[model samples]
Target: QPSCRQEEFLVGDECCPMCNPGYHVKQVCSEHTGTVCAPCPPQTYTAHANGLSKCLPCGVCDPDMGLLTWQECSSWKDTVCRCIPGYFCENQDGSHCSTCLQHT
Candidate 1:
C-alpha cells in the first residue's frame, strides 16, 4: 500500500495560495499550511503580495452625480471599484478615483 502519512507542503518565500489578483500574503507559513493572504477590502487592490505587506486601497466613486457609487468588492478579489453610467475607472491600476461628468 502507499504511504498514508500527511504530505507536508512547503510554502516558498513567494508562495500564495487562494490569493486573488490585487491581493497579497500578509503573514508567513508557520505550521506548513500556508500564510494568510489579505485582500484589499472594499475599495482597494494590490498588484502583488509583498512579504507581510498591506493590501492597497481601491478608488472611490463620486456620490454627488448619482452616476457613480462605491459597491462591494469582488468576491475573493481585491476592492477594484467599478463605475456606473456617466462614470468610469480612469486607470486599470485602481489608483485613480471615479469622477462624474457634468450634464449640460
Candidate 2:
C-alpha cells in the first residue's frame, strides 16, 4: 500500500512522489512518469506540495444567509466571510461557514 505524506502520493506499489506548488495530482505516479500533476488553472491554486487530486474552489458569501465576504477566495484558500450588519456568524468548519443565526 502507499504510505506517503500530504505532499506525496503513491505512484505504484509504494513509490511516493511530491506534487509541487500550484498543482494537483492529475494521475498517480506509475512506472512511466513520476507523479503526473496538473496545474491549478485560472480559478484554482495550490500553496504547498500536496497529493490532492484537484485544487479547491473559490468560496462564496451567501447574501441570504446574512454573510458578507471578508476575504476574497484564492486558488490556495477558500473564501472568508463575516456576518451582516446585525447578525452573528454561525460558523461551521473554517472552510464552510454557515449563515448567521437570529436569536430564538
Candidate 3:
C-alpha cells in the first residue's frame, strides 16, 4: 500500500488526513471507522493540522518573569507575550518576546 502524506495518518491499512487548525482529532480513522475531530474547548487550541487526541493547553503570562500577555489565547492561536514596561527579553519561543535583563 502507498504511504500516507504528511498531515495524514495511517489507519488500518489506508492513509487518512488529520484534523484542521483550531481543531484536534479525537480518534484516528480505522478500516471501518471514520476520523473524529472536534474544536478545542476554552483555554485550549490546536494551532495547526494535528492528530493529537487533546488540544494544547493555553499559556498564562508570569508577571514575576516580567512578562505581559499582549494577545489572549484562543482557538488555533497561542497567547502572545512580551516583557512589561521598563523590561526587556532574552530567550523566547521566537513568536513571543524574550525576557529582558533587569539592567537592560
Candidate 4:
C-alpha cells in the first residue's frame, strides 16, 4: 500500500493547511513547510472533524422568557459568538440558557 506522506498531500496555492470542521485556516503556510491549523472563531464551532468549510453559529439564551435561543450563521469559522452572563450551552435547542423568572 502506498504510504500517505506529507509530500503526497496537495497544498493549494495559498499554501495553507486544510481546515477541519468547525475550524478554519487563518494563515497559510510557506512553500518550505506544512500549513498551520486554527480553531474556529468565537460564536462558531465544528461538530465534526476535518474539512470544515464553515462554522456553526452559537446558540442564544433568554433569561426573562426562560427560553434558549440561537441561530446558524453563513460564513467561515472566523466570527466569534458570545452569550450574556448566566447563559450556558443548551444543545437541545442550540441556544444558551439565561436566568429564569424564578431566578429573578
lDDT of 1 by residue, 1-104 (tens): 33222322235433334444555566655646565666655555555424435565544454553434355445234333445665444553434444443455
- Model 4, range 4-64, lDDT digits (tens) per residue? 3332323454324455665654544667866556677677776544434445665444434
Which tens-of-lDDT digit does each residue in 1-104 have in candidate 3?
Answer: 66888889766676767999888887788777777899998999878888888899888888788788889889998887788777777655635664656672
Ordering by TM-score: 3, 2, 1, 4
TM per candidate comes to 0.36, 0.65, 0.78, 0.33
- What clash pairs does model 3 have? 88-100, 89-98, 89-99, 89-100, 90-98, 90-99
Tens digit of per-residue lDDT, candidate 2, span 34-68? 77778776667677778888886666788877778
Worst 10 residues of 4 by lDDT: 94-103
* C-alpha RMSD for every candidate: 9.2, 3.1, 3.1, 9.0
Which runs of model 3 end up more than 4 angstroms from their true locations? 1-3, 10-14, 90-95, 102-104
- What is candidate 2's CA lDDT for residue 89? 61
lDDT top scorer: 3
Comparing 2 and 3 on TM-score, the stronger one: 3
Q: What range of 10 consecutive residues in model 2 has the weakest lDDT sum?
A: 7-16
- State which candidate, 1 or 3, has the greater TM-score: 3
Poorest stretch of ten by lDDT in candidate 3: 91-100
